[PDB]
Amino acid sequence: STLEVHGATNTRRSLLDQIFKPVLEDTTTLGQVLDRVGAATKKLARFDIFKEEGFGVFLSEDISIRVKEKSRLVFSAGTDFGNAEGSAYTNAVVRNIFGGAETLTV
Amino acid sequence: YFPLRIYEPNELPERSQQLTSGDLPTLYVFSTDSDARLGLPSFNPGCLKWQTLLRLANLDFRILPSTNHSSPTGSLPFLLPPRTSPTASPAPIPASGLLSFARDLDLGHLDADLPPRAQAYLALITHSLRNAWLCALYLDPTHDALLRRLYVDPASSSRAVRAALLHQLRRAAAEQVATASSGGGKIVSLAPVDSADGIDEEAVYRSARDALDALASLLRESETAWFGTERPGSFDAALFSYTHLMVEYMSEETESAKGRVSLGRMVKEAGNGELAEHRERMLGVAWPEWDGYRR
Amino acid sequence: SAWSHPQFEKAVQLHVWGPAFGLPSIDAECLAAIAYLAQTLGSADYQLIQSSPSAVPTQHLPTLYDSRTSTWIGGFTSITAHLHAASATADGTAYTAFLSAHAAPLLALSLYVSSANYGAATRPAYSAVLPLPLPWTEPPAVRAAMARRAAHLGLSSLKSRIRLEEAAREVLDVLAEVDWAAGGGGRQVAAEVRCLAFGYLALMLLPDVPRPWLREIMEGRYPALCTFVRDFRARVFPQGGKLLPWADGGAQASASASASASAVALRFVRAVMAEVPLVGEWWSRWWTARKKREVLASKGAKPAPSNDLLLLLGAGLGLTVVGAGVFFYRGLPPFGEAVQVWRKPV
Amino acid sequence: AGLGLTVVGAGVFFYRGLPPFGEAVQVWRKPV
Amino acid sequence: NASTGTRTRSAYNATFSTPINGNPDLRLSVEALRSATQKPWASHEEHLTGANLRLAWLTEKGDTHALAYSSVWRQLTGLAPTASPTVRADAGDSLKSSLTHTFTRDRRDNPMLPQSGYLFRSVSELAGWGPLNGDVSFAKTEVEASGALPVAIGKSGVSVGGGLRLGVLYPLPLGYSLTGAAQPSRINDRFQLGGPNDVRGFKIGGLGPHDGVDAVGGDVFAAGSVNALLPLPRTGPDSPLRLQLYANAGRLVALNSKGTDKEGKEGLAMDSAAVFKGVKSAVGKLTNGIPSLAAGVGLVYAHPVARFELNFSLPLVLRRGEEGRKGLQVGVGISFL
């Protein structure tokens, strides 16, 4: 019927559009509807936009997906184990710039 | 059970005895000490409307200057009932409850659902004339002395604070004229147009002139000296609260060297002068014993 | 000096937004201006350049440009002031002032405040009429403005639907008795006000609006306004409004004279500069002052020469902040030595 | 000046960013 | 930039300080503060955005001095609830250019748990008068004494305590005179008395003239205390945790005129004789009648940088509407009475 995506505050409309517009092309065969919603919300997780803790999906009457953005700036010191005894780094990430993009700095 | 003695409470200080003593309910308006003692009309239209309404309701009250921070709401014109015990007082009455507190004969003509046409004419008062007044006062270099000696001078008596008070007053008035699409509708970054650079003033002045002409033409068809009825109501008070102050504080005879005939002369000459006759007939129903108006 | 009136010395081209809803434009001020010009002049007098607030010196979109005197005129009321029993004009002014406020906050409740309608219907329609990097700067500014305007209604992105119905009815009951389009009925007003009424009502009831409460109210309780809007649109804008004399090749071909990559980069860079906190605040003030002086000069008056105190103040704040930061982080070369030797004199 | 302005501009553009690109609620519905 | 979970919302001071004449004790300071606190005992807020210039000179005997010149703004802009006609009358805008001098003579063996010491501290302040312009004009004085004394049983700490605090607020004219029309105090400058620090067993603002649920201050005040500070029972001179057994007191009067009916009009202008009679009568009222009382047992924990009490007190004598407290009297801070 009608589906919504609550919490995707900084995600572009055309990206979620490319994902969730074919989901409405399933025109009660509830099984296939659930398979398509599952496939869509799974493909939505193969990006790195938002976390995996709260991928809620509510059915009523129709559909309502809840998501929570991950972050916009990440910093770290850490210590890498890339075949060496030890490496101190400063990894500064920008999780999302316009759509699903990124920008690191190590 | 636990306390042993009680001792006749602690007798509030001197300021809380010379100011909040009261005998009558007191209305806190933007006024001056020399005028508050005589009950003369305030110099702010948002408070003069309610002062006029309360005077028409035959309520016996007192007028004390205040400063917009001591209000149960944001804006000023609130009321405080008289003190019943020397250490406790009733709650304040905001601007919305003044007429509900006012209750002699019929307090029904002072609050009434206006006809649908009158709700269209009221926007002329609440937006057109209001933005005209705000632009002409807070953003006109001619009236710097008025703005200072009215709103800023009696506030702090310190130059480095009067400066900030003037700046915030001017910015807050610019943020309001730059919203009404009569004169300002400009779009800049995600922040309001808080300056006289986006409040283009010829449009505001022309809107005010047209509004005054329209209001005069509305008053002409009444046949009973008010806006359709027998005694002045909320519409008459709402229009008075602007026309009286425009005639008083903005009737500077300097016009020919600049053009743009001031607001007071526009009010005086609008139509056949029905607005001046109206404001002089209201001064004589609410203030029947006050002389010395018209500058 | 930025907070006072300015000091003075001792073939039209309408700029509008893009169609974006099945109507000649959006932003019912622009749509009313288009409907006014289309009924008054004739197809051989105006040009209807598609624009945006960054491409005009007035920074206000219903902007006309007279070509004989080269004067810029912004806003619908100023435009109709240009290009031009008493109860008729009285009611015209009354209803114009009642539409410009109490109807613009109602149209901005749908399409701008409800995040279900902004993004699904409005934001794409703004992005479809702007050069590519601009949909990231201007649509959010327009939404912020139309959300600040729709305040004082006590409503937000929030059974809490009887209140929206009451807020809409308190306006539509005032508009309902005007007899907006007929030769007989209630209170005839004027043409210039009927066009503004059409602008606002047509932008109210026509769009798609996933949550169309306003369209429901208007079609359920006020059939006179729906009929007026439908007939006015069919009479003035037949076939979507493609017969209106836009620039050379229609709507999208109008944003070509002032949409080179250079000008668009300038617009984007200014709109993003106006967002750095302090430098951006003062830059916006200086730029608006400059543009107002430009519009005034084009009008025919002689403004005060210039006062760069605003840009000087913004640059001073920025340079002082960065200078203090650097001077207190890096500092000055050391004031002492590793070894310092004293010895008694003889 | 280009080095300085570009450094500070990239820093600000990547720290504060641009106004959000999406909404709290986004609604799809099938056409008929 | 210090916020606070309850009262304070902001802070920014920047405190630039240098030694003077190559002397490490004599310092100089130039601070620029901008804070916005909250005063729920008298329901408002206060916005200070001034700057002061201080000259602290620590003396070789262990004493300390200070001389500061402060200029603030002091806006009162938080009257959201039903508060009082008083807190509305002092609606808020001021300057208070002032000049203050503190004098600390510390001799206590432990700053957070005195046992065998002594302490005298005096603060005086002269706000706008003569060269000091501004809106307020007063000469506020505050004196503090202390004490601590063990008597008998190594060193088992009995440490009979002590305490005393006075204060006076005297409104002066506004220029180069000791005689003239002086305006009465505001809610900004008057004293507060009571709470987990000043007088235990009372609400954070109590013991004063009250305009309802709202604690308006007073001019002339006087406090006191007695302690026992017994050690942990049967255990000896152990860790900072000690027992406490205290009495208390408290008085906070406000200055009325009530003696000269010649004024009449212009109530906010008292001539010098009227102010003198008012302060005399205020002190006289502070004399007669048993002031106030409290008593309880506490759990003092002398942390190195603080003090923690967790008391339990029961108010014995009050005035009408002084908002005493009886439940568990949590206390924490640096200066306790």
Residue numbers in the entry:
A (entry chain E): 47 to 73, 78 to 111, 127 to 171
B (entry chain A): 26 to 128, 139 to 262, 264 to 289, 292 to 333
C (entry chain C): -32 to -23, 2 to 75, 105 to 178, 237 to 424
D (entry chain F): 393 to 424
E (entry chain B): 172 to 324, 329 to 512
Text of the article:
The SAM complex facilitates outer membrane β-barrel precursor protein folding and insertion into the outer membrane. The SAM complex consists of one copy each of Sam50, which spans the mitochondrial outer membrane, and Sam35 and Sam37, which sit on the cytosolic side of the membrane. Sam50 forms a 16-stranded β-barrel which is minimally closed between strands β1 and β16.
In addition to using lipid nanodiscs, we determined the SAM complex structure in the detergent GDN using cryoEM. In this sample, 3D reconstructions exhibited several conformations, with monomer and multiple dimer conformations present (here, the term monomer refers to the SAM complex, with one copy each of Sam50, Sam35, and Sam37; the dimer refers to two SAM complexes). All of the dimers appear to be non-physiological, with an up-down association of SAM complexes not anticipated from functional studies. However, we were able to determine a structure of the dimer with the most homogeneous conformation (dimer 1) at 3.2 Å resolution from 117,339 particles. The SAM complex monomer determined from lipid nanodiscs was fitted into half of dimer 1, revealing that they are in an almost identical conformation. Therefore, we performed particle symmetry expansion in dimer 1, focused on only half of the dimer, and proceeded to refine this monomer to a final resolution of 3.0 Å, resulting in more clearly resolved side chain densities.
